[PDB]
Amino acid sequence: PQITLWKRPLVTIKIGGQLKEALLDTGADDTVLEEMNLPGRWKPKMIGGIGGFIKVRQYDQILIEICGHKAIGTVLVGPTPVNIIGRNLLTQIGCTLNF
Amino acid sequence: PQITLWKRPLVTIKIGGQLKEALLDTGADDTVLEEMNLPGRWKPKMIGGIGGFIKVRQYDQILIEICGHKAIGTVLVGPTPVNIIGRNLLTQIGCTLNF
Numbered sequence: 740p741q742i743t744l745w746k747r748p749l750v751t752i753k754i755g756g757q758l759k760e761a762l763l764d765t766g767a768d769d770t771v772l773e774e775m776n777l778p779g780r781w782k783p784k785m786i787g788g789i790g791g792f793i794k795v796r797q798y799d800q801i802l803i804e805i806c807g808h809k810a811i812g813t814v815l816v817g818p819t820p821v822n823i824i825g826r827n828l829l830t831q832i833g834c835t836l837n838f
Numbered sequence: 839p840q841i842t843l844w845k846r847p848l849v850t851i852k853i854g855g856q857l858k859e860a861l862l863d864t865g866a867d868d869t870v871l872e873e874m875n876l877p878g879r880w881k882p883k884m885i886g887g888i889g890g891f892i893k894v895r896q897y898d899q900i901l902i903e904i905c906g907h908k909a910i911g912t913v914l915v916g917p918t919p920v921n922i923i924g925r926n927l928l929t930q931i932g933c934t935l936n937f
């Protein structure tokens with residue numbers, strides 16, 4: 740589809756058997772999800788933006804379905820105020836900026 | 839143009855007669871630029887990112903050129919890690935997401 744930017748580009752995603760709303764974020768190198776209890780091993784990480792840094796847990800090879808498009812890659816989980824789909828997964832679903 | 843997301847969507851912008859590099863950021867409601875001198879009046883404002891809130895200078899109705907596309911709107915100037923172009927200006931240049 741085509742998504743305009745009048746409002747926040749929120750879309751439904753499916754991860755770990757749960758449906759969630761997430762932001763298609765071309766400014767996010769990586770995908771950062773709100774706190775959730777995923778299984779498997781993880782590695783600590785810190786990511787920075789406006790306001791400073793937050794601590795997150797890096798999970799690798801996590802399947803996410805974004806508007807019916809399947810993608811698999813690294814997913815960070817931490818105290819983010821918003822679910823954020825980053826470029827690592829946006830590429831896998833063929834997402835592009837256009838103007 | 840059509841922009842894939844395998845690399846950061848960085849572009850050259852023109853503001854206040856100066857050229858700069860900025861990130862097209864669909865996850866940003868507003869445009870936030872690094873510290874710089876801009877002509878005209880400004881009023882203090884606060885914005886929140888993933889790491890907390892920062893103090894910024896709000897410049898209204900600022901002319902800014904993004905890849906030869908003109909925009910006029912609000913520009914926030916503060917300690918952001920990166921020059922980011924938010925939806926307030928991406929809409930002015932007709933920017934959409936497509937997959």
Ligand SMILES: CC[C@H](C)CN(C[C@@H](O)[C@H](Cc1ccccc1)NC(=O)O[C@H]1CO[C@H]2OCC[C@H]21)S(=O)(=O)c1ccc(OC)cc1
Nearest residue numbers: 766767768769786787788789865866867868886887888920
């Ligand atoms: C360094 C580039 C940019 C600041 C990075 N951010 C993605 C943004 O899209 C962020 C994503 C975001 C969106 C809402 C709340 C927290 C973060 N939005 C944002 O900060 O926008 C601010 C400016 O306009 C306002 O509108 C929203 C907040 C304000 S981020 O959230 O901090 C981030 C996301 C993934 C990362 O992986 C390495 C690293 C950093």
